[PDB]
Amino acid sequence: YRKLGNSGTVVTSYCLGTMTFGQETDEATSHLIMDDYIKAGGNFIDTANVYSAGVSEEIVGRWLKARPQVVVATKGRFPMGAGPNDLGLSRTNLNRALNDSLRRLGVEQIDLYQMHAWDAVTPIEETLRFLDDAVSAGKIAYYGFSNYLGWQVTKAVHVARANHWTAPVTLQPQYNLLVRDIEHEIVPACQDAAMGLLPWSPLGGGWLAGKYQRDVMPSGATRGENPNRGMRTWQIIDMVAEIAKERGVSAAQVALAWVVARPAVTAVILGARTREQLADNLGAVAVTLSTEEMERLNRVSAPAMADYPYGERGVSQRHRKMD
Numbered sequence: 001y002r003k004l005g006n007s008g009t010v011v012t013s014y015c016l017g018t019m020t021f022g023q024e025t026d027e028a029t030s031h032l033i034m035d036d037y038i039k040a041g042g043n044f045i046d047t048a049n050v051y052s053a054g055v056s057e058e059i060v061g062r063w064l065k066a067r068p069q070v071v072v073a074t075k076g077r078f079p080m081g082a083g084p085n086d087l088g089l090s091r092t093n094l095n096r097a098l099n100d101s102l103r104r105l106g107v108e109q110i111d112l113y114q115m116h117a118w119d120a121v122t123p124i125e126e127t128l129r130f131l132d133d134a135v136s137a138g139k140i141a142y143y144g145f146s147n148y149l150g151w152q153v154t155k156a157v158h159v160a161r162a163n164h165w166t167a168p169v170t171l172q173p174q175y176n177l178l179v180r181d182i183e184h185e186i187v188p189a190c191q192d193a194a195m196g197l198l199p200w201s202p203l204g205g206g207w208l209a210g211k212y213q214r215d216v217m218p219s220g221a222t223r224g225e226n227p228n229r230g231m232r233t234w235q236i237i238d239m240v241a242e243i244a245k246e247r248g249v250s251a252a253q254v255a256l257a258w259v260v261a262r263p264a265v266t267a268v269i270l271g272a273r274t275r276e277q278l279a280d281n282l283g284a285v286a287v288t289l290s291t292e293e294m295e296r297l298n299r300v301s302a303p304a305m306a307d308y309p310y311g312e313r314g315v316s317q318r319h320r321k322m323d
């Protein structure tokens with residue numbers, strides 16, 4: 001399935017993460033995971049400059065040289081060195097940060113440029129003005145955010161609208177059956193601005209895929225190096241598993257098919273480290289959960305909150321009954 005990312009550019013329902021392409025996966029296995037992804041019919045690569053110190057981008061860049069169209073996304077904001085202006089949404093750092101993602105990807109235009117995180121030190125106006133100048137220059141097509149809060153998305157959107165700049169297209173949050181707190185302020189804020197979600201960590205870092213042996217709950221390997229903030233967790237993993245094998249499919253596969261069908265979601269980022277793991281994740285394309293499986297999964301992962309701003313009672317009093 002093809003969707004837009006709040007713009008005219010369409011993109012396939014699954015996105016290829018490339019975090020692994022320097023740390024764990026080597027460049028040859030990276031090229032073949034990408035070759036598989038394409039051959040499965042994807043057109044969406046997500047990378048970052050800080051992924052393996054930009055090696056991640058260079059492998060993607062070399063693979064684009066070998067292959068002769070794909071929608072490419074990358075990010076800024078995080079430390080590329082240990083200096084004080086080697087991080088930040090300042091236009092000084094972002095200016096070289098975009099030039100270096102450009103030379104490392106060997107493209108002349110990045111399709112999606114993303115702020116990897118909010119930056120309280122840079123005024124948002126400076127950042128958005130830098131991104132609009134980049135759009136005018138043909139260095140980037142669109143921009144979006146990752147790890148912005150709700151009110152922060154809302155302030156950016158309207159500040160862009162106030163200065164006749166382009167609108168943000170996407171938000172890249174962490175979102176899976178275990179990590180659903182973006183539904184209180186961040187999702188409402190994107191839906192209000194017609195924006196699309198790009199969820200990453202859809203297997204919750206492994207907790208949802210099984211592959212363990214009824215593990216210990218504070219095991220730091222699968223997640224965070226703490227193993228339970230939201231990674232009850234065991235009930236969710238269990239429900240996912242039951243639905244998994246009655247449908248004759250992997251537990252990973254119905255968790256993936258759960259994220260792809262949630263409101264506002266344009267494309268899920270896949271963290272395949274292997275060719276086989278890519279095949280195991282892309283099996284979820286065939287799975288389409290029924291309205292019931294999903295409303296099941298929804299309520300068992302429903303993030304309960306202290307009553308006032310984001311739990312039952314505050315929600316209920318913000319609601320307006322039509323009657």
Ligand SMILES: [Cl-]
Nearest residue numbers: 004005011169
């Ligand atoms: Cl997009």
Ligand code: NA
Nearest residue numbers: 002003004005
């Ligand atoms: Na769409």
Ligand code: NA
Nearest residue numbers: 001260261262
């Ligand atoms: Na779907």
